[PDB]
Design a protein around this ligand. Structure first.
Ligand SMILES: Nc1ccn([C@H]2C[C@H](O)[C@@H](COP(=O)(O)OP(=O)(O)OP(=O)(O)O)O2)c(=O)n1
Ligand SMILES: [Mg+2]
Ligand SMILES: [Mg+2]
Ligand SMILES: [Mg+2]
Length: 341
DNA sequence: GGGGGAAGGATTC
DNA sequence: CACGGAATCCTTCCCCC
């Protein structure tokens, strides 16, 4: 089995550049302003100029300014990015039937039937980097290997604007080398729980008793990491289907007042329901981020579909439930719809 | 024991 | 003492078959 993984480069940032060549050469930071304050918000991404100096995705727009007070800061125009993304996803579909759009800027293609060996898979990759480069002028990184996980890992190692094949031999060596924290699905807390067990490489996972891994990091991550180390990880490439659709917004000020909060709640329902398109949901969840970025929610699943009107009513009861059971104020409020008919 | 719900938890884009 | 907006899969506790 051969998997080809593609991941666009500093995507949102690169897109703004392709739409305005003047930005090229200058550090760029794409951010999402909460509207709270003139510079309240987080960073979606920054190009590699700004990246060099610590400006990474997720940090406050304010932290970024201290560092690069003179970088170019642009508001995120997501509809534009989705547009560019779909056009590139369409070009990829041409190279293989089995394709999985994993996110706004990445995809896994099973090219087992389109190539005979790793050398051929490689040129397919170069063929793909060029197409996108001449059709959209967006550079991307490609990683190639035997399964989805190693295909991703490969692309991270080749970024930016690269291509990298990790063959069966190269895989065995990666199971031995490679910091376990670099494995997809392993974040900071999980990485720490593994350090307390003396686990630094995937291979080390074979040495611990299964129930000691299961007890420490849950059974899922256990099995996942185990088969990975045993070179038995084989998950099919499948087309993904949305399980949920939502919308959350930051209020102008924190609050615990129902009448002050309803308008924000209703806007979020209005916009979520438009995103649903044909879909009719059977479950609804009101989600809130407390004043201390803590997130809480209350939802309800119905015997049948939920019309927009019903969501307005139910959402208010659910919000009142949050207010009743939680004493702190709310900073962000919104909804999530799921269990589509 | 395990399916479906309901709140959290962790990770990732 | 800051601090965005989405999505997804998983784990713990509860009802119920
Ligand atoms: N915390 C994040 C991370 C990503 N994104 C969006 C904008 C990013 O441009 C896009 C792709 O995210 P990646 O980090 O996976 O890819 P990048 O292009 O940002 O970095 P790279 O150079 O690895 O491709 O997803 C976001 O909104 N918030
Ligand atoms: Mg990516
Ligand atoms: Mg990218
Ligand atoms: Mg919490």
């Amino acid at each position: 089995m051969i998997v080809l993984f593609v991941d666009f480069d500093y995507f949102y940032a690169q897109v703004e550049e392709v739409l305005n060549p003047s930005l090229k050469g200058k550090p760029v930071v794409v951010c999402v302003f909460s509207g709270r304050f003139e510079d309240s918000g987080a960073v979606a991404t920054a190009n590699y100029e700004a990246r060099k100096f610590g400006v990474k995705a997720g940090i406050p727009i304010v932290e970024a300014k201290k560092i690069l007070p003179n970088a170019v800061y642009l508001p995120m125009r997501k509809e534009v990015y989705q547009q560019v993304s779909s056009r590139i996803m369409n070009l990829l579909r041409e190279y293989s039937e089995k394709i999985e759009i994993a996110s706004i800027d990445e995809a896994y293609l099973d090219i087992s039937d389109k190539v005979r060996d790793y050398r051929e898979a490689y040129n397919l990759g170069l063929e793909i980097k060029n197409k996108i480069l001449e059709k959209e002028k967006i550079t991307v990184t490609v990683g190639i290997s035997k399964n989805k996980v190693f295909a991703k890992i490969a692309a991270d190692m080749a970024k930016p604007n690269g291509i990298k094949v990790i063959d069966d031999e190269e895989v065995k060596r990666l199971i031995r080398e490679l910091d376990i924290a670099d494995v997809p699905g392993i974040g900071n807390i999980t990485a720490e729980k593994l350090k307390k067990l003396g686990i630094n490489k995937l291979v080390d996972t074979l040495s611990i008793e299964f129930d000691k891994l299961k007890g420490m990091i849950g059974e899922a991550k256990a099995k996942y990491l185990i088969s990975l180390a045993r070179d038995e990880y084989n998950e099919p490439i499948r087309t993904r289907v949305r399980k949920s659709i939502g919308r959350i917004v930051t209020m102008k000020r924190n609050s615990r007042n129902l009448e002050e909060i309803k308008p924000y709640l209703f806007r979020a329902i209005e916009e979520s329901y438009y995103k649903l398109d044909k879909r009719i949901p059977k479950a609804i969840h009101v989600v809130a981020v407390t004043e201390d970025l803590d997130i809480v929610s209350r939802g309800r699943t119905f015997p049948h579909g939920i019309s927009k009107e019903t969501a307005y009513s139910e959402s208010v009861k659910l919000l009142q439930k949050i207010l009743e059971e939680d004493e702190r104020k709310i900073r962000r409020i919104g909804v999530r719809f799921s269990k589509f008919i």
